Amino acid sequence: RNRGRLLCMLALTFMFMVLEVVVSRVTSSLAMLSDSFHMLSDVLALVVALVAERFARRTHATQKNTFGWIRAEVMGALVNAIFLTGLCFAILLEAIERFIEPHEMQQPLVVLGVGVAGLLVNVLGLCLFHHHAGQLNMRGVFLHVLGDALGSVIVVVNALVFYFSWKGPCWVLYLDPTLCVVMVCILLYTTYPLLKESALILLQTVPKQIDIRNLIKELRNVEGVEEVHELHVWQLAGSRIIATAHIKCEDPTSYMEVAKTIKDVFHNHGIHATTIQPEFASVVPCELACRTQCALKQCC
Amino acid sequence: RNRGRLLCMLALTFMFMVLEVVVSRVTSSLAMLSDSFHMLSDVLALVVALVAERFARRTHATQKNTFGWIRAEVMGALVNAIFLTGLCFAILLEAIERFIEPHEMQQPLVVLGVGVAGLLVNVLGLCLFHHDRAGQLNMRGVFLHVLGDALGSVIVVVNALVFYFSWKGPCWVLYLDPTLCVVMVCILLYTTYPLLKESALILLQTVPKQIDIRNLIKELRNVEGVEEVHELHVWQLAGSRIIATAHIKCEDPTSYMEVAKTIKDVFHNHGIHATTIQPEFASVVPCELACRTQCALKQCC
Ligand SMILES: CC(C)CCC[C@@H](C)[C@H]1CC[C@H]2[C@@H]3CC=C4C[C@@H](OC(=O)CCC(=O)O)CC[C@]4(C)[C@H]3CC[C@]12C
Ligand SMILES: CC(C)CCC[C@@H](C)[C@H]1CC[C@H]2[C@@H]3CC=C4C[C@@H](OC(=O)CCC(=O)O)CC[C@]4(C)[C@H]3CC[C@]12C
Ligand SMILES: CC(C)CCC[C@@H](C)[C@H]1CC[C@H]2[C@@H]3CC=C4C[C@@H](OC(=O)CCC(=O)O)CC[C@]4(C)[C@H]3CC[C@]12C
Ligand SMILES: CC(C)CCC[C@@H](C)[C@H]1CC[C@H]2[C@@H]3CC=C4C[C@@H](OC(=O)CCC(=O)O)CC[C@]4(C)[C@H]3CC[C@]12C
Ligand SMILES: [Zn+2]
Ligand SMILES: [Zn+2]
Ligand SMILES: [Zn+2]
Ligand SMILES: [Zn+2]
Ligand SMILES: [Zn+2]
Ligand SMILES: [Zn+2]
Ligand SMILES: [Zn+2]
Ligand SMILES: [Zn+2]
């Protein structure tokens, strides 16, 4: 389903770019012809989303990657968030430039028509991506489409203002940069949670719904286990959470009695992919340690 | 010293921005002001590396992150690579626009002076970022960004010389800048693709290139204690820190610890030291310890 939405959006973007080039060649406008090439950024964003979605379905172990490419959509969401942040910074800088030196728009009616067409295309994109793991990439595309829609609304309003008012001509020239600044603020406000979540997923951060202190406290509550060390909890993608710990039991015969208990304790929380390594005999913190232990070759 | 390196580079970037602003104000040319305000891309590129370097020295286990923030350097390298690729694509679009309609600068002399100052700053940056593995990645990203800046400065200096010595006015001189810009973006994309690939692979839990999964599992199954090995997950955290987890089946819990020493030694022969091996003592039974409500969306691989 997601691939169809992305392909339809890509087709719409290409059609709109063709329309903009054609209308520029008819109207002999070089400025909006150059503006038409600015949709290659949205084409690239859609291509990145498509690649991430295509690779996210290879959820099988591979000689190159043991987990499969389940982390592809989260990577694509991070890339799209970074690209959108860069675009927001660039258009904020451009708005500052227009503040410093004002810009006059030529042919308001053609620009208004192109803006209405772009707004309709972006509304179709929003109706494609209104969302009714994989949600990260989809919301990354949705934020870019929403930014495009806001830009289209701004340019339509700007064209209407020049056509209706421009021949107080002084304040009219400054309506575009302030609206662009407001749109940058809104876009960054909506994009920061997505970028934060993606970056915190790529880093091996504990998911926000799991507290390590409580998990450790319940882990020591099992009768067989004596102490828990080297506890690593991280999120692969979506609800795929992997937990790893070392335990001391001092009773290999009843290990399955307490291994199932530890599995149940992990299963009570949103953890189902675990790997618990027992150790049997306190000078050494961990019996199974490397012969030449180095801080540069071990986790944490 | 790495942090002081980035502080020195940031200070030089800021003072060159101030110099560009002053030159714009005295010269009363808006192009210099526009360039000075566009130069903030390097300020953000250095700030990202500084943040990553500061945050990745916290290798201790944190409440929010049990592995520490040692992956922050690789994250910063990836962010710098993506930012550089975006800047390259923007440069390519600008070159296309210049090809469609050319641009002529008003005063070659001021452009030449500003470009010479920027070229000196950038060659100092290269001499400064001349050079663990994760530390190299962030340094590699900033070095590539400074190299792209230096190539841009060389291009602008050469182009300014060409206008000052040739233009009075051939047609080809107006198109000298886009050709050099295209060459620059080609070279910079070629030299930044390996960094982006390496960073993205590291964050995608890719097996390090020096580990063969088939050989590893064949060696693991070769020891006497184990009966079979299933769900062998191997991934690289950052630099030379590789974590490998596996599930094994032993003959009996008695004398299991000898099997664990042998498996640890087998992993230690390869570049893996931070391991975790879960024995599964005794239907097909792929894994004795499995969740009751098995789901493909709630499990690794
Ligand atoms: C397009 C690319 C090249 C750049 C993307 C923007 C970055 C420059 C931004 C995005 C999110 C930012 C981070 C968001 C949150 C924080 C936590 C912040 O921690 C604090 O000190 C918070 C205050 C406190 O705890 O006292 C330090 C800056 C940092 C890492 C920020 C550093 C700058 C970042 C990486
Ligand atoms: C003169 C201005 C227009 C230039 C600088 C613009 C941006 C660099 C700033 C302006 C307001 C900032 C935002 C103000 C508030 C927040 C909320 C906060 O993130 C959250 O969403 C946390 C929860 C919350 O505050 O509701 C911190 C980031 C963010 C988006 C900030 C991101 C950076 C922004 C967009
Ligand atoms: C928004 C921008 C700035 C993001 C960064 C640029 C991306 C558009 C590029 C950077 C690396 C590229 C990837 C590099 C490697 C590959 C592998 C390639 O697959 C193969 O190697 C096929 C081999 C074969 O069988 O012939 C498919 C394209 C892809 C995913 C590329 C897709 C486009 C990517 C993500
Ligand atoms: C207006 C016209 C003249 C513009 C022409 C632009 C091209 C000459 C540029 C644009 C993007 C460049 C590509 C960007 C990224 C890469 C990846 C880089 O890494 C590899 O793929 C390794 C070599 C290989 O595996 O083939 C090789 C160069 C290449 C294909 C570049 C080749 C030259 C390209 C196609
Ligand atoms: Zn867009
Ligand atoms: Zn479970
Ligand atoms: Zn241990
Ligand atoms: Zn550890
Ligand atoms: Zn730079
Ligand atoms: Zn198992
Ligand atoms: Zn070892
Ligand atoms: Zn698995």
Residue numbers in the entry:
A (entry chain B): 6 to 137, 240 to 274, 309 to 422, 429 to 447
B (entry chain A): 6 to 136, 238 to 274, 309 to 422, 429 to 447
Sentences from the paper on this structure:
ZnT/SLC30 transporters are major players in regulating zinc homeostasis, by harnessing the proton gradient to mobilize the divalent cationic zinc across membranes. ZIPs increase the cytosolic Zn2+ by either importing from the extracellular space or releasing the stored Zn2+ from subcellular compartments, whereas ZnTs remove Zn2+ out of the cytoplasm and maintain physiologically low free Zn2+. ZnT/YiiP mediated Zn2+ transport is mainly powered by proton gradient. Here we determined four high-resolution structures of the plasma-specific hZnT1 and the synaptic vesicle-specific hZnT3.
Local resolution analysis indicated density quality better than 2.5-Å for TMD Zn2+ sites, which showed clear signs for Zn2+ ions present at both outward-facing TMD translocation funnels. Similar to the Zn2+-unbound OF/OF ZnT1 structure, three Zn2+-binding SCD sites were also identified in Zn2+-bound OF/OF ZnT1, without an additional TMD/CTD interface SIF site as seen in hZnT8 or bacterial YiiP structures when incubated with zinc. The two Zn2+-bound protomers are well aligned. Notably, a short segment of TM2 extracellular half (residues 41–46) in both protomers adopts a stretched conformation. As a result, zinc is chelated by three residues Asp47, His251 and Asp255, with His43 swinging away from the ion, which resembles the Zn2+-unbound apo state (trihedral-network). With Zn2+ supplementation at pH 7.5, the 2.65-Å resolution map reveals that both protomers retain the OF state with Zn2+ coordinated at TMD sites by trihedral ligand composition instead of tetrahedral network. When His43 was protonated, His43 sidechain became mobile and distant from Zn2+, and TM2 segment stretched.
